[PDB]
Amino acid sequence: QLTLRALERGDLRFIHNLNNNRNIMSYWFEEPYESFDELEELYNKHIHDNAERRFVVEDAQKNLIGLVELIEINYIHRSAEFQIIIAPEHQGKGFARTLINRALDYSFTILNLHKIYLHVAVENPKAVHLYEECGFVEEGHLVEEFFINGRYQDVKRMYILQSKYLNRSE
Amino acid sequence: NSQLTLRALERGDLRFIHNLNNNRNIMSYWFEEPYESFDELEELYNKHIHDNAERRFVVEDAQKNLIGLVELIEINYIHRSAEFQIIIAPEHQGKGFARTLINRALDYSFTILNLHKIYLHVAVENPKAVHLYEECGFVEEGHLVEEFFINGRYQDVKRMYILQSKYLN
Amino acid sequence: NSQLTLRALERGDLRFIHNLNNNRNIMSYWFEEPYESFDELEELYNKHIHDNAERRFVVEDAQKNLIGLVELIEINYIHRSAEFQIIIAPEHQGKGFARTLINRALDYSFTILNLHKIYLHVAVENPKAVHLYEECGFVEEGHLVEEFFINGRYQDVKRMYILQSKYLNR
Amino acid sequence: QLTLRALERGDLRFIHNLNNNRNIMSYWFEEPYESFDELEELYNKHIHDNAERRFVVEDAQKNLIGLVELIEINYIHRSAEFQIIIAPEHQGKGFARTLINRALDYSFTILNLHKIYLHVAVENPKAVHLYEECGFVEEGHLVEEFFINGRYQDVKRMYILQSKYLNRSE
Amino acid sequence: NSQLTLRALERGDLRFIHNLNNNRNIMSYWFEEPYESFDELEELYNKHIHDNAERRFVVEDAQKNLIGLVELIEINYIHRSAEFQIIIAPEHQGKGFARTLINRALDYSFTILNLHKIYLHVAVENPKAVHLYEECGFVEEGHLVEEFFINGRYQDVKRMYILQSKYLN
Amino acid sequence: NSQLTLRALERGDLRFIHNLNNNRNIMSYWFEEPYESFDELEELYNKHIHDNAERRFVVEDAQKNLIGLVELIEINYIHRSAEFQIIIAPEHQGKGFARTLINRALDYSFTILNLHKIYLHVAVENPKAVHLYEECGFVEEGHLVEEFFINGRYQDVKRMYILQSKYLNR
Amino acid sequence: QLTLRALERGDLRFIHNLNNNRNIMSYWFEEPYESFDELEELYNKHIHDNAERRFVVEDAQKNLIGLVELIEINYIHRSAEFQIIIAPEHQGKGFARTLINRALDYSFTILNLHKIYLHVAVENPKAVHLYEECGFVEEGHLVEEFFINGRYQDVKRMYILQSKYLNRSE
Amino acid sequence: NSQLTLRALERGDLRFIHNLNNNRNIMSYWFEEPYESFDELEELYNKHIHDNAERRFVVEDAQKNLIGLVELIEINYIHRSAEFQIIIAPEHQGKGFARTLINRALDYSFTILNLHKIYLHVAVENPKAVHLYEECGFVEEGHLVEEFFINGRYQDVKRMYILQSKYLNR
Amino acid sequence: NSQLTLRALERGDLRFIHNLNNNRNIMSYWFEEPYESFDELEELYNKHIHDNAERRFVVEDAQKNLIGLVELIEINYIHRSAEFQIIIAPEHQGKGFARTLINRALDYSFTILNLHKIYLHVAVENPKAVHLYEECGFVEEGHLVEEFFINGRYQDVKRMYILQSKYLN
């Protein structure tokens, strides 16, 4: 009952809301921003840039559930970095699995990428568990990689390959 | 069917065109630029409004219901050839419209645009469509191997064509 | 028939212009650029607003119904010539307005634009049009072979002219 | 009871109306135009160009009476060409004298021009009489100067100088 | 009078400014470009919005009635000087406002802009204004001969000035 | 006081920003360009929307009244420093919001922007402001002589700083 | 021994020389020009415009013999207007036939045009004879079509079709 | 004297043009923009390279000495008129070239540009110039009062014309 | 042959490329824009310098003699396919270079660009070339009917392809 669709300009307020409660700077095409005004101008400036692709997941009643973002897309190595955010009022209702599958499905069956990877805070073992359930595997434990809430934190880098995803039931 | 009209695409038709996409498990293109959002489609529309490499038409019935899209792409004016595609919206498939749509497109291509050759691709795994095109005078000239990545695998397609001299005679 | 007035084309008349084309089996042109959509037409209009190689006028009745279009194209200010065409909306064909529009267009061309020669094309397989133009003082100067691809085949056209000296001495 | 004020964009429809019933091409900064659309674009394009200055004369109830135009303004020789047009519904109500004085007043007491000249058709002796009454004097009888209604016409060039205007009662 | 406020000119004030002109028999200027129409004024406004050679303020009363205009032009930031003019709208002349307006302008010039010298021109044929400026501490430093063409003849003007050290002490 | 929230400045807050200036006897600046009018401000805003040398935030209460402004300027990403200022609207002065805004601004600067040093200027002839900042952990590092021309005379200002290491170990 | 090649910028002096001794205005993409400077700027401005194509014919020793120009190229009706000029020192050496065949060959076997037409002065029966020998046929006798050396002259319009050219020996 | 040739002005002739001005006590103009320096002239040249309201030609002898300049300005393609001026370099005055240049300029104007009327200005206090023009078929149509400020005073000028019909029937 | 090197096209190579054209009786294209002159080619080169739809390489020997041109066009990075062409200059045809050139192109396409499929067109009336491509692992997937207007008639071409998995295994 959830559907994935391309981000549109009318979704920017939702996006901006989602970044509001985060203890790290937000980027659009690697340019940092804080305001809705910046975001809108960056959106317009990068509208044809294929290095990042974003999608929103909506329910049957068109409530926005979450954001799926693919950034650092490289079309020789056929890799991209993935992040998802679910709106606070929809957390813990088991939608994160659905969003991850929809993003993997799109990445691997339409965009024809070879590898998707993500970062997750070491101090977030619940999210680690989710990504592992969905076929991600740790390939890195990056040390003091991001300054987050007043201190350099460690993150896990985790990946999945297209060949795994598409053939693992065959 | 005699009631179906073909007209040029206009900017107020892009919502329809964009909806025709979200059902397809292949990337969509406008003048060979990929796009996913309506916003992207609109900017691409504006950017290529004078470009004669591609031409698009929509078909409406009598009540101005949008029936489908006719698209000519890769238009070359020395060799006088174009690649043709048609999409019919969901709620109007299975109504015996396809033939009329194909006929209006061929008519325009050959009676107004003065093209020599029109070709199309159809999935090998789509035999009913092959049959249909065959009835409208298309003939296979190629079986393209692993040509397009569609829904998670590289798929073969038939390339079918028809010529102006055949259609007009 | 003296209730018909000729005015310069304006951007709000482009819908009417575009409608007049849908009834013709020949590619339409604006300043020699082909177009099919209203959107195209409107941008071409904007692009050529100051270009004096073509001039257009619409004819209206006392009640402001749009009757037809007069176009002067390939205007050359050394040789003082131009190609002329009229198009009457379907719903007003056969009402006896064509002779009036022709006279208005000639009057403008010869008394205000100070042109020396006006010519037109007419289909050879359109003899009653040939007859109308003769009655209005045009004379055949060419029979152009396979000149235009129209409705699936190359068609022959008569070129017909009239001069300023003849018109102004009627 | 008549007042002279600078032309504004909202007056362009009036201007365009005034040119409608004229048997000569109209110019804005020496560019010919027929449509309202052209006029508006030319207006915007030349908004800072000091080679021409235009003014509208309005009554007490803000009805537009006429147009005063100064063109070919040259600030070394301090000369300009003047034309006035009165709207057909206000002709023959003795406003032409008032418009001419207002334009001369502005030309000579604010713009500090040295010479104003105008052209008038030889075949318009009524207008010749008006300008003579207002202190203009013939300096030229220009032969076949303009093509007007199907034939080259003669015009009088007539002038007045600032020193005449400002000191003739002293 | 203590109720009169000075604020920066804004785009919605240009109608007022333009009206203040049509009564004057001299050409009006914006950043030394002459203008006659409102349309010209608006484009000039937009074109020079960042230019610090000239600064303008309007004075309003308590009910936001527009009282007049204060204009500093020829602003030079090495020599720290500017030429000052004030115009009071018709329906508010003869109300004992001029002094307050001049005082607000001098205050701004000397307490915020940190100018050293402010000068103005007044027509010789306008003695009552000379007297007024004199009361506000201005002194004649020149009698400019045939300086401006105004209403059909070249007219003389007085140039009057006041310094920051005098005003602030 | 925990009902106050800090958000990024947006174009719809510029009226409030502009209002805050009319109460100050010092020239105002936006990215080091001086401005006096709202029109100026709005163009400067647009011009500098992507410039990361200055960042601004507005504080609102639970009922969305605009309480004040936090500005970080001269931001340098090598030396990791910035100059900080707050301004509280007149109608909310003295209500005990200043300490809260300061803490929010410091928290942002030190936990999200990862700055090393924040400094400010305060008037020497403003001792109770000096006292507020001391209470919030700032220490004097300069007494700048005749630094700014304010209200008719050059005034002295204290420069006061705080470091990231001190703040994060409170 | 003659070869046809695309016009290049270094050939412009030759082109300009060729127009020098002609009693009609010269055009580049329907813009008139007299100077070498104009020509060069027009060349650069229209470098990607497919409405006209020009070629120079050179001998074995790279002497420029003549110019072949195709203008008014239309890619729906697949027609173009052709002109050739031979440099005065190479006239009457039987090169005109060769240039005409090379242009027809290119038009019909590479550009895939359907129709080529040209104008020739009625008062130039020698050139009429040449074009007739090379398969052109009169389709029009255009009356007072061009002002040439102080008077309106008549011209023959003459054409050849691709199907004639390609199949006439079959 | 038939060794003199008329060619279009080119950018390498601007030094000569500029030199011709230093000998005149009147402001010089290029497309109605006044100029004093060579630098100005060169930019004005570039700016107006495609503008057809003025055309210029230089006359050279068989040995390529620059003899003089022919200028056609205020060219109007409806009324088919232009203002003509010649200037002969000081060192070639009195040699009998002026009549030849005049004839060349008239021939061009009337046989290639297809103009209807050419006019010129000559100083009233320059009677031998008046005499030259009369001999070349010009006739006075105006005596313009205080038309141009020249060398410290406003001077009167004769306007003198010739028509195409008269010239071509000589 | 082991001495032949493939490098990226550069602007000083456009003279060579242009010369390779004047012998061919088909229109030449750069990013699907037709061109005839060197001047046009140079402006097209500059205009598309960042466009990744087409990639070109020249092959030189040891003495930096230009041997030929390798061109990948219609490059699509979702389907991972490109159309390939090679031209060998006159004075170097018939020297047993073609195979090496084709091998360097396939190598680059499949080992660096990570394309999945490479296809080419060859004239049906050119059997010796078909044979050659066949030896390098290409296989016919289409016989395109009256596809291109070449030297005065519409000609048929074979479409041949090879896949990355085949080449690399």
Next chain:
Amino acid sequence: NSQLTLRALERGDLRFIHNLNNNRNIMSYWFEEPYESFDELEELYNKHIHDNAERRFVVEDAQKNLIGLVELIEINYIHRSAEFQIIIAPEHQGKGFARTLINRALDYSFTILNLHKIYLHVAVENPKAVHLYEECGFVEEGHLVEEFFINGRYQDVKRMYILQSKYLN
């Protein structure tokens, strides 16, 4: 002296103009923009090449030695006034040239430009120059108080003028 010629400034003269500056203890301006370097001067020159608010001329002798600069600034074409300055290069001061230079400038201003009034500023602390201008028909119309910051203090200047009717009669 009869040998001295006035011509319009050209771009190759900017080196001379820039050298005339480095001796003066006041900021230099071009169209009221301050400048210090040659590079700045050259860009300002190019930017204002069409601006008729200021006009400049250089005077050369017979051997094309540059003698000095004549500058008209603040040119107003309604009031027909301009501010005039002249600088004579070091190695040519004290040669009885100044008068001729002033005469050529006045001649141009009044016989060609058709200005009504020319004015200049001279330092009060420069009496010999005042005398000179007086001999050329200039008269004091103002004593401007603390007008310019020059070499570390605000200095007074005389404003002197001459009219067209006087010069030409």
Next chain:
Amino acid sequence: NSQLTLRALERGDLRFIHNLNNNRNIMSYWFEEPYESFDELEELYNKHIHDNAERRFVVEDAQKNLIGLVELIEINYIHRSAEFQIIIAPEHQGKGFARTLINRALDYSFTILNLHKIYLHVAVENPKAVHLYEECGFVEEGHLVEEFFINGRYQDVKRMYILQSKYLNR
């Protein structure tokens, strides 16, 4: 080895940069745009001259031979990290310069750029490179699976890091 100097990259070093790539079986990038030709590289250089996300330096010897390249990319000024790579020209490999270049690059990164973390990628199937970096204080934090398509297959890479705190306390 202390005769080696590190300087900023300049446009005259791009030939050397380009030469270093021809020896690598991986697509090259400039500010994440892939390039193959020198022409491309030179335009990308120009385009990104002010972009601070990447910085490059070339190492030369006392005789000015170009030894190698140090590149810092993905530079982030909040988290204070960057990815580092060196490349030594073929002819200078094995000479013992790599350790020196590494130390120079680290010194710059940590003492002038004030970065917190430097990381690099090295091929897993390049163990002696792994050994060099370990000796220079780098430690493995990831083994990235099938990260880059190199020479016909997806290869694994080690990610290796070093911190500012460790380096500056050596």
Next chain:
Amino acid sequence: QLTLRALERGDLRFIHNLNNNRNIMSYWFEEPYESFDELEELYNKHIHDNAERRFVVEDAQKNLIGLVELIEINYIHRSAEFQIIIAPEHQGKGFARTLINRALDYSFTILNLHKIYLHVAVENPKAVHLYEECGFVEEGHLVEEFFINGRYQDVKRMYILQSKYLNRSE
């Protein structure tokens, strides 16, 4: 015997050389740069920007001795920050006093600034002594203000006022 002159583009190599041996990032109008190419582009971009002014001091033989830079120039508060650098081969030859006086002279007698201030490393007592001798006084001891050679360093801010400089001998 030393002279101060405005910086010119031909001096940029000298400037770049001077920054070479410095353990802090270099800025031009607050934009950081390392390469000569960046510097040149920044120079051109800011050529009319009055926020910074630079001067070079040359001897009698035109050897460049040093750079004087005024940055953060503010024309309301009439203050600027000053730095000087002397080329290594000219250090310790007593030129620093001369450069400081020339800069103060220019600042105070031509630019009409009110205040000049500078920063000097606390760990550079020799330079502190020099500036004190030349009338500068400490107004601040800024704590951990700049990251310089691997650690946050303290600097003295020191100032002098125009009124002191100009009147202290009176």
